[PDB]
Amino acid sequence: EPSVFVRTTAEGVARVRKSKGKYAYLLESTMNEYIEQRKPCDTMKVGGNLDSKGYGIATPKGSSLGTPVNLAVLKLSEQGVLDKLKNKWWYDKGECGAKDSGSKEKTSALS
Amino acid sequence: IFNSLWFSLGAFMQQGCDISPRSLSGRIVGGVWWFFTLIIISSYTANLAAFLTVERMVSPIESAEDLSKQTEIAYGTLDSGSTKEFFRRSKIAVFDKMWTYMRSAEPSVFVRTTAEGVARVRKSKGKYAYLLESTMNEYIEQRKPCDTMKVGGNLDSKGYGIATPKGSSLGTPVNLAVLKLSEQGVLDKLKNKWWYDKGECGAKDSGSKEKTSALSLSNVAGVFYILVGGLGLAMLVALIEFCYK
Amino acid sequence: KPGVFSFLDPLAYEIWMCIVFAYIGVSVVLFLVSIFNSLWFSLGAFMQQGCDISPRSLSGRIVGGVWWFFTLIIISSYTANLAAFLTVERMVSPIESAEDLSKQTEIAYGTLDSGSTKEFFRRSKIAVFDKMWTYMRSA
Amino acid sequence: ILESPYVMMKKNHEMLEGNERYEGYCVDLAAEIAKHCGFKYKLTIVGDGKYGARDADTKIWNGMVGELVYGKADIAIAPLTITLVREEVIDFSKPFMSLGISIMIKKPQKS
Amino acid sequence: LLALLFATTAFLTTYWCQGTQRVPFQLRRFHTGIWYSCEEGEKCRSFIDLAPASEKGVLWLSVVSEVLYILLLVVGFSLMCLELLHSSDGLKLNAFAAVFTVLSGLLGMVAHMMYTQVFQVTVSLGPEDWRPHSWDYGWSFCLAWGSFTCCMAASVTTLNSYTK
Numbered sequence: 001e002p003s004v005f006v007r008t009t010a011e012g013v014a015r016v017r018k019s020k021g022k023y024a025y026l027l028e029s030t031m032n033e034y035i036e037q038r039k040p041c042d043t044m045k046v047g048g049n050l051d052s053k054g055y056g057i058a059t060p061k062g063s064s065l066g067t068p069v070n071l072a073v074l075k076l077s078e079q080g081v082l083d084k085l086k087n088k089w090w091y092d093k094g095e096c097g098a099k100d101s102g103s104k105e106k107t108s109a110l111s
Numbered sequence: 112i113f114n115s116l117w118f119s120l121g122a123f124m125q126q127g128c129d130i131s132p133r134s135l136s137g138r139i140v141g142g143v144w145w146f147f148t149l150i151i152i153s154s155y156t157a158n159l160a161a162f163l164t165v166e167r168m169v170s171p172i173e174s175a176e177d178l179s180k181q182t183e184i185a186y187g188t189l190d191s192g193s194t195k196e197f198f199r200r201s202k203i204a205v206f207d208k209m210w211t212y213m214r215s216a217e218p219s220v221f222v223r224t225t226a227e228g229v230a231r232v233r234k235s236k237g238k239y240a241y242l243l244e245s246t247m248n249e250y251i252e253q254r255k256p257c258d259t260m261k262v263g264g265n266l267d268s269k270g271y272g273i274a275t276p277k278g279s280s281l282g283t284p285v286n287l288a289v290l291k292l293s294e295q296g297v298l299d300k301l302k303n304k305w306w307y308d309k310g311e312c313g314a315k316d317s318g319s320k321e322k323t324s325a326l327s328l329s330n331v332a333g334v335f336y337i338l339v340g341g342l343g344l345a346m347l348v349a350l351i352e353f354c355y356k
Numbered sequence: 357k358p359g360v361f362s363f364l365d366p367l368a369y370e371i372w373m374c375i376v377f378a379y380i381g382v383s384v385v386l387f388l389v390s391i392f393n394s395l396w397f398s399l400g401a402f403m404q405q406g407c408d409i410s411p412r413s414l415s416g417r418i419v420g421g422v423w424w425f426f427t428l429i430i431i432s433s434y435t436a437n438l439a440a441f442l443t444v445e446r447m448v449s450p451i452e453s454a455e456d457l458s459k460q461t462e463i464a465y466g467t468l469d470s471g472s473t474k475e476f477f478r479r480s481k482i483a484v485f486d487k488m489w490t491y492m493r494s495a
Numbered sequence: 496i497l498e499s500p501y502v503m504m505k506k507n508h509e510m511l512e513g514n515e516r517y518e519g520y521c522v523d524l525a526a527e528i529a530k531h532c533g534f535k536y537k538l539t540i541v542g543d544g545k546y547g548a549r550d551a552d553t554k555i556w557n558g559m560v561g562e563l564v565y566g567k568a569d570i571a572i573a574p575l576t577i578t579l580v581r582e583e584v585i586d587f588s589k590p591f592m593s594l595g596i597s598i599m600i601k602k603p604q605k606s
Numbered sequence: 607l608l609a610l611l612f613a614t615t616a617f618l619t620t621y622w623c624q625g626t627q628r629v630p631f632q633l634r635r636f637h638t639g640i641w642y643s644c645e646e647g648e649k650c651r652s653f654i655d656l657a658p659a660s661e662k663g664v665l666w667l668s669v670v671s672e673v674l675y676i677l678l679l680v681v682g683f684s685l686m687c688l689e690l691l692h693s694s695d696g697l698k699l700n701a702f703a704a705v706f707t708v709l710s711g712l713l714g715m716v717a718h719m720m721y722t723q724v725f726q727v728t729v730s731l732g733p734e735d736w737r738p739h740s741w742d743y744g745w746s747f748c749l750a751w752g753s754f755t756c757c758m759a760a761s762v763t764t765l766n767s768y769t770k
C-alpha cells in the first residue's frame with residue numbers, strides 16, 4: 001500500500017526512474033534486455049532469472065508444418081542465427097552499447 | 112628559500128615549526144595550506160577504516176568478452192566434447208577469438224576430465240579459468256571447499272529434454288507431464304533439493320560467514336623502500352659536505 | 357575480558373617488533389649531521405610534540421621527516437583497525453529467534469535423536485521450521 | 496547415466512534393491528512422471544556410459560541414444576542435450592532445464 | 607664480534623620453527639631450518655626454494671641480500687685492524703668502517719624481513735604437506751635480531767671516538 005502494481009510496462013519503466021531507485025519492477029528478461037539498451041539507459045537488469053520460460057514458434061495442432069519448423073529452429077539455434085539477430089535487435093539496434101555496461105566504474109577509493 | 116622549505120614540510124602534517132613569521136600573510140596563508148593538508152589525512156584514515164571493515168572480494172571478470180580481451184588468466188574447456196566443438200563452430204568473432212586463443216594455447220588448457228578441470232582452477236590460483244555447463248557449475252559451486260564459482264550469464268541457450276524413441280506414444284503424455292511439473296515448480300523444488308539442500312555449502316550461508324581481523328605485515332613492507340632509499344640519501348648529502356670540508 | 361594483550365590487538369606482534377626496529381634506525385642518521393641527545397627527538401618525532409632541536413634544512417631534516425611521514429600512517433591504521441574490531445564486535449548480535457539459527461550456519465543446533473521435537477520439524481510445513489529441518493537432515 | 500546430482504547410487508545401494516538403489520534429480524523426476532503418467536518404471540544404467548553418438552563409418556548410435564533408437568530402452572529420463580542430429584532419430588520432449596556454457600572461476604580470496 | 611657471531615647463527619639455523627602436524631593421521635614433528643628442513647622419524651632434508659614462481663624471484667634477491675649482509679660485517683674489522691696497525695689519518699677509516707656495519711644490517715634486516723615475508727606467504731599457501739600449527743619463530747633468528755642492535759651499539763661508541 002499504495003499498489004506497486006502498475007497499469008502498463010512503460011509506466012513501470014518510468015516509475016522506477018521517478019522514484020529514484022526505491023521502486024524496483026519485475027518484468028520478463030528479454031524485454032528487460034531491450035529496455036536496458038534504450039536511452040536514457042538508467043534502468044538495468046540485476047540477478048539471475050527467477051524461472052525458465054521459453055517462447056516457441058506455434059503451429060496449430062496436427063499441422064504438418066511444425067516438424068520442419070522444429071527442424072528449422074533447432075538448426076538456427078545451433079548455428080547461432082538467433083544469437084546474431086539477438087545481437088542485432090538488442091545491442092546493434094540498442095540506443096546504448098554492449099560495453100557501455102563496462103563503464104559503470106567499480107569500487108574505487110576516495111572520490 | 113631552502114631554509115623554510117623544511118618548515119613547509121614542518122607544516123606538512125605535524126611537528127610545530129620553530130621559525131614563525133609571527134603574524135603577517137606568511138603566517139596566515141602558511142596556515143591555509145596547513146589547514147588544507149589536514150583534511151587529506153583525515154579522509155585517508157576514514158577511507159582506510161572502511162576498507163579494513165567491509166571486505167568485499169571483487170570478482171575480476173564477468174563475461175567471456177573479458178576473458179577474450181585479456182590474456183592474464185588462462186581459460187580452457189574439456190579436451191573433447193561439444194563445448195570444444197562449439198567454439199570450433201561458432202562464427203561469432205568473440206567466440207572465435209577465444210577459439211583462436213585456445214588453438215594457440217600453449218600449454219594445452221584442454222583438460223582430460225571435468226574433475227581435473229575443477230582442481231586445475233584451484234591449483235593455478237585463479238589464473239586458470241574453466242568453461243563447463245551451467246547446471247553442473249551450479250552443483251560443483253555448492254560442494255566443499257566451495258572455492259570455485261560461476262560468473263556471468265550463460266553463453267547460449269541449451270536444454271535437456273526427456274527422450275522417448277521416435278514415434279512412441281509415450282512422449283506426448285510425458286510432454287504434458289513436464290510442462291505441468293515445470294509450471295508448478297516441481298522441478299524448481301527438486302532443483303533447490305539436489306543443488307542447495309544436497310549442496311555442501313549454502314552460498315549465502317557461506318556468504319554469512321566472513322569476519323576477518325588484524326592487519327598483516329605485508330602493507331608495511333613495501334614502504335620500507337622509501338625508508339632505506341632515504342637512508343641512502345643520508346650519506347650522499349653528507350659525503351659531499353666532506354667535500355665542503 | 358583480557359588485559360595487556362588487548363592493547364596489542366590491532367597491530368600484529370611482528371609489527372610491534374618492526375615499528376621499534378625501524379625506529380632505532382633513525383638514531384645515528386640524526387647523528388650523521390655531525391647520539392643520545394637526538395634519540396629523544398626521534399621519540400619527539402614519534403607521533404607529536406614538535407622538536408626544539410632542528411638541524412634546519414639538510415638531509416637530517418628531510419629524512420627525519422620521512423620516518424616522521426611514515427609513522428603517522430601507522431597510528432592512523434591503528435585507529436582504523438581498532439574501530440574495525442569494535443564495529444564487528446558491536447554488530448555481533450546474539451540469537452533471539454529460530455529464524456536467526458536458520459539464516460546463519462555458524463552456530464550449529466540440534467534436537468534429540470528421537471522424539472516429537474525431531475518429528476515436529478519433520479512435520480512442520482512452515483518454511484522456517486522446514487529450513488531448519490532441511491539443515492538438520494543435512495547436518 | 497550415473498551423474499551427480501541427477502542420478503546417483505545410494506550409499507547403501509548394495510543394501511537396497513530394485514530402482515531404490517538410485518537417487519538424484521532425475522530419479523525423483525522419474526517418480527514424478529510415474530505420478531503423472533501412472534506407470535511402473537525400471538531404472539537401468541547404460542553400459543558404455545555414453546550420452547549417445549553416431550559412428551562415422553558404421554553410423555551406429557551408441558549410448559542412451561543407441562538404447563532408444565535400437566529399441567533396447569523404453570524412455571530416457573536423463574540429462575541429454577537436445578541436438579538436431581538426435582532430434583531426427585528420437586522424439587525429445589520440451590526442455591525441462593534451460594542451460595548453457597558457464598564460466599567457472601575460482602572465488603577470490605587474494606591480497 | 608657478537609653481532610657477527612649471531613648473524614652467522616642465522617646462517618646456521620637448524621630450526622627456523624617447530625613443525626606440528628599432530629592431527630588425530632597421527633602425531634608429527636618437524637624442525638625446519640632457515641634452509642635445511644629437518645624433521646622428527648629422525649631425518650633431515652633440504653626443502654629450499656619452494657613455490658610459486660615469483661616468491662622464488664623473491665628468493666633470488668633474498669639470498670643476495672643474505673650475502674651482502676655478511677660481507678659488510680667483514681669490512682668493519684679490516685679497518686679497525688688497520689687502526690691497531692696505527693695503534694701499535696686513522697679517523698677517516700674507522701668512520702668509514704662504521705658506515706658499512708650500519709649499512710650491513712639495514713640490508714640485513716630487510717633480508718631478515720623478506721624471509722619472514724617468505725615464511726608468512728608460504729604458510730598462507732600451507733606448504734605442500736608441511737603446514738605447522740607452529741610458527742614459533744627462530745630461536746637463533748630471535749638471536750639474529752640481537753645482531754642488529756649489536757651492530758648499532760658497536761657504532762655509537764666508534765662515532766663517539768670520531769667526535770674528538
Ligand SMILES: O=c1[nH]c2cc(C(F)(F)F)c(N3CCOCC3)cc2n(CP(=O)(O)O)c1=O
Pocket residue numbers: 189191192193194195225244247498546574575576577
Ligand atoms: O549431449 C550431451 N549431454 C551431456 C550431459 C552431461 C550431464 F549434464 F552430466 F548429463 C555432460 N557432462 C557434464 C558434467 O560432467 C559429466 C559430463 C556432458 C554431455 N555431453 C558432452 P559434451 O559433447 O562435452 O557437451 C553431451 O554431448
Ligand SMILES: O=c1[nH]c2cc(C(F)(F)F)c(N3CCOCC3)cc2n(CP(=O)(O)O)c1=O
Pocket residue numbers: 470471472473
Ligand atoms: O508426552 C510426552 N511428555 C514428555 C515430557 C518430558 C518432560 F519434560 F520430562 F516432562 C519429556 N522430556 C524432555 C526433557 O528430557 C527428558 C524427557 C519428554 C516427553 N515426551 C517425549 P517427545 O516424543 O520427545 O515429546 C512425550 O511424548
